[PDB]
Design a protein around this ligand. Structure first.
Ligand SMILES: Nc1nc2c(ncn2[C@@H]2O[C@H](COP(=O)(O)OP(=O)(O)O)[C@@H](O)[C@H]2O)c(=O)[nH]1
Ligand SMILES: [Mg+2]
Length: 175
């Protein structure tokens, strides 16, 4: 195809589009970048510990980096004109959603990512102990959020179910 490469057209034109993709460790943001098949993934290490991967089909830039971490996860992170915020959650991790909630809530508070559409990918939906979207949507309190227009597509990066269905949404929103 590139069934994906294609959802992003119309968006094609001289100012840079930037889509942020962050989430906790093991949410599957990397499998997401790769299945997306939009060019080859370039890793950079902007400041010690902050491993930032990136991809780019013309003017749509997909910047990705982990959050909620290790010892100090940081400033340096204070966002140009990022119009899309994709936040990915490991559905099988019941323990950590709460952190996934501190991290969704902490980033959305920022000035910079202010008018930035929220697409969340409820990810490991292929495991018998899965947490459905509705459970993910309460456990993250996206129904209180009285500003952003958001969305949560259940997926399975690995085989890629829901990616086209969740990205038709972001696309149109930014459109
Ligand atoms: N069953 C299943 N495992 C997944 C899924 N997505 C990610 N994984 C696996 O769990 C780990 C996820 O790591 P990765 O995709 O690099 O996540 P990242 O640290 O957020 O970049 C890898 O061993 C993946 O193979 C998924 O949708 N289903
Ligand atoms: Mg990774």
């Amino acid at each position: 195809g590139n069934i994906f490469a294609n959802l992003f057209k119309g968006l094609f034109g001289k100012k840079e589009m930037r889509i942020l993709m962050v989430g906790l460790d093991a949410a599957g943001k990397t499998t997401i970048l790769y299945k997306l098949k939009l060019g080859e993934i370039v890793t950079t290490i902007p400041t010690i510990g902050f491993n930032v991967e990136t991809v780019e089909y013309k003017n749509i830039s997909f910047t990705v980096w982990d959050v909620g971490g290790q010892d100090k996860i940081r400033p340096l992170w204070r966002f140009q004109n990022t119009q899309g915020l994709i936040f990915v959650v490991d559905s099988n991790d019941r323990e950590r959603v709460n952190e996934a909630r501190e991290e969704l809530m902490r980033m959305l508070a920022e000035d910079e990512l202010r008018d930035a559409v929220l697409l969340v990918f409820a990810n490991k939906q292929d495991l018998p102990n899965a947490m459905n979207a509705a459970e993910i949507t309460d456990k993250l309190g996206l129904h209180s959020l009285r500003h952003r227009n958001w969305y949560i597509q259940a997926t399975c990066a690995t085989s890629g179910d829901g990616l086209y269905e969740g990205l038709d949404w972001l696309s149109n929103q930014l459109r």
